[PDB]
Amino acid sequence: RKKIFKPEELRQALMPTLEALYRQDPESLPFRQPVDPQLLGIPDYFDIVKNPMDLSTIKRKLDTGQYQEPWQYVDDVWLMFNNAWLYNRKTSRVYKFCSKLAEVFEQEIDPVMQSLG
Ligand SMILES: Cc1cc(-c2ccc3nc(C4CCOCC4)n(CCOC(F)(F)F)c3c2)cn(C)c1=O
């Protein structure tokens, strides 16, 4: 049945899944803040990645009630992953670290989504 989710319900359910990503070391570090192409020396980045996303931005959106439904949060986490797999070479640390975060996220999000429905 279709359903209305309160901002605090989503925060309580979903913030632990986000913290599970932030706990990963070494893999979470490049995902903690928005990519800064100038600092990183990669001026092509915003030419390739049209809709940047990162953990800090997702955390803020959860804290400020910007998700109405859990799939919107899942979509942002996957936008972050897809951006990293699009831009980075397959041998790079960021690409392989992304793959690890996707494994962790898949494990954490499943029982939480069952709980929200
Ligand atoms: C999603 C994404 C993220 C990055 C990205 C973001 C932050 C990074 N900080 C570092 C270093 C730099 C100097 O010392 C501290 C770590 N790197 C370099 C890689 O280091 C690491 F592998 F350990 F993370 C950063 C990279 C870059 N692109 C292109 C992204 O797509």
From Swiss-Prot:
Modification after translation: Methylation of the KIX domain by CARM1 blocks association with CREB. This results in the blockade of CREB signaling, and in activation of apoptotic response.
Phenotype for E103R: Abolishes interaction with ASF1A
Domain Bromo stretches: 5-112
Consequence the record notes for mutating F46A: Impairs binding to acetylated histones
Region (Interaction with ASF1A): 82-100
Compartmental location: Cytoplasm; Nucleus
Region (Interaction with histone): 44-90
Outcome (variant: W85A): Abolishes interaction with ASF1A
Quaternary structure note: Found in a complex containing NCOA2; NCOA3; IKKA; IKKB and IKBKG. Probably part of a complex with HIF1A and EP300. Interacts with GATA1; the interaction results in acetylation and enhancement of transcriptional activity of GATA1. Interacts with MAF and ZCCHC12. Interacts with DAXX; the interaction is dependent on CBP sumoylation and results in suppression of the transcriptional activity via recruitment of HDAC2 to DAXX. Interacts with phosphorylated CREB1. Interacts with CITED4 (C-terminal region). Interacts (via the TAZ-type 1 domain) with HIF1A. (Microbial infection) Interacts with HTLV-1 Tax, p30II and HBZ.
Disease note: Chromosomal aberrations involving CREBBP may be a cause of acute myeloid leukemias. Translocation t(8;16)(p11;p13) with KAT6A; translocation t(11;16)(q23;p13.3) with KMT2A/MLL1; translocation t(10;16)(q22;p13) with KAT6B. KAT6A-CREBBP may induce leukemia by inhibiting RUNX1-mediated transcription. Rubinstein-Taybi syndrome 1: A disorder characterized by craniofacial abnormalities, postnatal growth deficiency, broad thumbs, broad big toes, intellectual disability and a propensity for development of malignancies.
Domain comment quoted from the record: The KIX domain mediates binding to HIV-1 Tat.
Described function: Acetylates histones, giving a specific tag for transcriptional activation. Mediates acetylation of histone H3 at 'Lys-18' and 'Lys-27' (H3K18ac and H3K27ac, respectively). Also acetylates non-histone proteins, like DDX21, FBL, IRF2, MAFG, NCOA3, POLR1E/PAF53 and FOXO1. Binds specifically to phosphorylated CREB and enhances its transcriptional activity toward cAMP-responsive genes. Acts as a coactivator of ALX1. Acts as a circadian transcriptional coactivator which enhances the activity of the circadian transcriptional activators: NPAS2-BMAL1 and CLOCK-BMAL1 heterodimers.
Protein name: CREB-binding protein
Taxonomic lineage from the root: Eukaryota, Metazoa, Chordata, Craniata, Vertebrata
Gene from which this protein is expressed: CREBBP
Residues of the full protein shown: 1081 to 1197 of 2442
